[PDB]
């Protein structure tokens, strides 16, 4: 996948966003912006050019599942890769992610190696 792919990292906890941005940087992905919930995310996305979303599940105003469904049903953004992040792997939450079109699913905390594994899975499926 292109090193200059533009990521949006979405989490209501600024420290978690910083950590994810830093892991991306460690992998060579320097083109990264941040959003603090699903509403903030959609605002940022209007600027265009975004190529990959990493979103937390639990956020105020619009949560990660709500954001994912919105992106997937959007006329312009429907095929954007979205990696969902959760605090705990549960059947119900995984199946919810699957039904909504999550490109990937990862439990926090995760290492740069795990992030790379999940990104590569998504890139492979999408032919990126």
């Amino acid at each position: 996948a292109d090193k200059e792919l533009k990521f949006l990292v979405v989490d209501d906890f600024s420290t978690m966003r910083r950590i994810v941005r830093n892991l991306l940087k460690e992998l060579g992905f320097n083109n990264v912006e941040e959003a603090e919930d699903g509403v903030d995310a959609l605002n940022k996305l209007q600027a265009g050019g975004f190529g990959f979303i990493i979103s937390d599940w639990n956020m105020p105003n619009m949560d990660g599942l709500e954001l994912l469904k919105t992106i997937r049903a959007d006329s312009a953004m429907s095929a954007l890769p979205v990696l969902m992040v959760t605090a705990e792997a549960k059947k119900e939450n995984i199946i919810a992610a699957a039904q909504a079109g999550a490109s990937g699913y990862v439990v926090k905390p995760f290492t740069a190696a795990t992030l790379e594994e999940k990104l590569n899975k998504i890139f492979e499926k999408l032919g990126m």
């Binding site: 792997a89 549960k90 059947k91 995984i94 199946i95 992610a97 699957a98 999550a102 990937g104 699913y105 999940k118 899975k121 499926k125």
Partner: peptide, 14 residues
């Protein structure tokens, strides 16, 4: 059930 979670994740390509 943890095995069911791992199977589920694998089946989804997650």
């Amino acid at each position: 059930s943890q095995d069911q979670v791992d199977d589920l994740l694998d089946s989804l390509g997650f």
